[model samples]
Target: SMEQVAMELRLTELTRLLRSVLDQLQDKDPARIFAQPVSLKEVPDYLDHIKHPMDFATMRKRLEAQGYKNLHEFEEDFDLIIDNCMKYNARDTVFYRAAVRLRDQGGVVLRQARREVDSIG
Candidate 1:
């Protein structure tokens, strides 16, 4: 019984950590383009170009529902956000440059999270 209790507690802690990090990521993107999913009307071929798309709203919803079993799952969605932007937008455009900035900032956030989570035990 205690084992199960501890596991759920850890999951709660993990969820809070992920949610905080997501907020930071959203703040980093001044344009707020990554805040929501790409609109098909705005970028008609977005679905065609991106095989696996991810957005902040989707992540938040998943986090709220405890959709992630582990940090790796959350990280995958985070990476997908950056990767999709990098692939879909041109290098000369603002979106691509914002993605580049976000990628760099993301690595530090991920590293910090790992260290924090590892210490929970």
Candidate 2:
């Protein structure tokens, strides 16, 4: 049916948009700081403070697995990455600064993608 075609097209577009968002964030992280999960061995008490720790690698997997139902879902993980860093690290820390940039710079593209998706639907 026409509805099914439109829905399939939208899903394909959404997947492509998400991958672009992921790539943009990874590129922004020049130091590969947010590429992987925080090493538990390095920060034993990390989980004690932040329960929902998120990272780029996991996001990549989730995208591949079609785990994101919409741009908002992708946005949640994006926020988590920033929030986890901000919560665990101090404002003066390099981690905190990088996260702030990610939220500001990468966040712009995220909002744009959301608007684009809405128009697509």
What overall lDDT goes with each candidate model? Answer: 0.88, 0.88
Q: What is the C-alpha RMSD of each candidate to the true structure, in Å?
A: 1.3, 1.9
lDDT of 1 by residue, 1-121 (tens): 9999988988888899888888887888888978999988988887888988899999999999978888889999998999899888899999999999998987888898888878874
User: Which parts of model 1 are misplaced by more than 4 Å?
Assistant: none
Query: Judged by lDDT against the true structure, how good is candidate 1?
Result: 0.88
On residues 62-112, what C-alpha lDDT tens digit does candidate 2 reach at each position? Answer: 988777879889989989999999989999999999999888889778777
Pairs that clash in candidate 2: none
**Considering summed lDDT, which 10 consecutive residues are worst modelled in model 1?**
112-121
What is the TM-score (0 to 1) of candidate 1? 0.92
